[PDB]
């Protein structure tokens, strides 16, 4: 790989520079290089990996949705035929998005998850696994679509089981996992009631534990609680 000659510490330093520069494709390539050094990632390094790839794939998903909407409009009655270009370009963006998701999943499988023994690392990576399978599910249509959805569900579920056993109900990773798994239920699995139930129970159980927290911890936990409440407001 093209980052094989660069020191691990240099790749991390450059990832932080790339973030400041809003160069997220570079950031992701630096963090991929850092993972490929073979060592486990620290808390801060896990967050850099996640920020890099969520920014890259987020841009691709936004583009895909714009193109898919145009393509949908084209297939309505009354619409003039404009040739294969919209489908072709949606397909190009889709293939690139799938490639990035496969790359992230490949890093998780080789070998981040298997070496992650502490709850904060393992839950973090399984949450990532669920998210990137969820992004693959958003664009899936073929024979493996149910399997893609089930792979996201399985990852999220394992993360949930560990987080419930090993983390307090206010832990930000636990909260963000619950937020994203609730979105999976609502947007991917056609299970809005499960989505609502999970968001409500997560919010309530976090509320009850806020008393144990420092001011700083409270800020982080309450921020994600408000995001859960925002979705509950949207869904009800």
């Amino acid at each position: 790989g093209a980052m094989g000659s660069m020191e691990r510490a240099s790749l991390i330093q450059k990832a932080k520079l790339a973030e400041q520069a809003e160069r997220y494709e570079d950031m992701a390539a630096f963090m991929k290089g850092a993972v490929e050094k073979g060592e486990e990632l620290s808390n801060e390094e896990r967050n850099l990996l996640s920020v890099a790839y969520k920014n890259v794939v987020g841009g691709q998903r936004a583009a895909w949705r714009v193109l898919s909407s145009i393509e949908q409009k084209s297939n309505e009655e009354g619409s003039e035929e404009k040739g294969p270009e919209v489908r072709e370009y949606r397909e190009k963006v889709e293939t690139e998005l799938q490639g990035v998701c496969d790359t992230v999943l490949g890093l998780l499988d080789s070998h981040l998850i298997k070496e992650a023994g502490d709850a904060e690392s393992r839950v973090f990576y399984l949450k990532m696994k669920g998210d990137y399978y969820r992004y693959l599910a958003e664009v899936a249509t073929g024979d493996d679509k149910k399997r893609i959805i089930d792979s996201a569900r399985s990852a999220y579920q394992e993360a949930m089981d560990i987080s419930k056993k090993e983390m307090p109900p206010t832990n930000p990773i636990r909260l963000g996992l619950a937020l994203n798994f609730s979105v999976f239920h609502y947007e991917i699995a056609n299970s809005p009631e499960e989505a609502i139930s999970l968001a409500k129970t997560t919010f309530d159980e976090a509320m009850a534990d806020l008393h144990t927290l420092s001011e700083d911890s409270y800020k982080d936990s309450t921020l994600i609680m408000q995001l859960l409440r925002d979705n509950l407001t949207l869904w009800t």
């Binding site: 996640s50 920020v51 937020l179 995001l227």
Partner: peptide, 9 residues
């Protein structure tokens, strides 16, 4: 629906 945002590190 919004999922978890990605603030700067």
């Amino acid at each position: 629906t919004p999922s978890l945002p990605t603030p700067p590190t």
